[PDB]
């Protein structure tokens, strides 16, 4: 929960997962880039960030 | 007398190292904001907003 | 080269050194126990020792 980490403050956590790339779902009302390149998508962009 | 036999020794010891005092400079510390800050029940400390 | 008493005064210097290793457990450690349990403060290890 995004809120809840936003409250909290305390980032171990999600530092543990994205650092062990455990398959997380991050859940809140996030902004997102629509991006069209499929030179983007192959470099995989959308996992750097 | 001086003897050379009796005055000769070794002295060993480390080769470098950093001695720190301050302690804390390593210690990076922020703070909930104050209005959902909770006290030891785990409630807001001021629960009348 | 030293005399005998010169070297048992180096040697205890040498030997009784006050420094002791310091590591990120030591620093967690050394913060008071009641404010590394309290949510309201983050504290992270962010430095290299």
């Given amino acids: 929960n995004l809120e809840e980490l936003m409250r909290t403050g305390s980032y171990a956590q999600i530092t543990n997962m994205l650092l062990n790339n455990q398959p997380v779902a991050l859940v809140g009302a996030l902004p997102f880039v629509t991006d069209s390149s499929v030179i983007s998508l192959i470099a995989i962009l959308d996992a750097t960030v | ?22 302690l804390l400079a390593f210690v990076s510390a922020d703070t909930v904001e104050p209005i959902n800050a909770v006290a030891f029940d785990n409630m807001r400390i001021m629960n009348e907003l | 080269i030293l005399h005998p008493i010169d070297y048992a005064f180096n040697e205890y210097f040498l030997q009784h050194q006050l420094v002791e290793p310091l590591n990120n457990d030591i620093i967690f450690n050394y913060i008071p126990e009641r404010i590394r349990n309290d949510v309201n403060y983050i504290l992270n290890m962010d430095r290299n020792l």
């Fill in chain 2, 1 to 22: 007398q001086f003897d050379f036999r009796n005055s000769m020794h070794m002295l060993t010891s480390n080769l470098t190292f950093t001695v720190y005092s301050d």
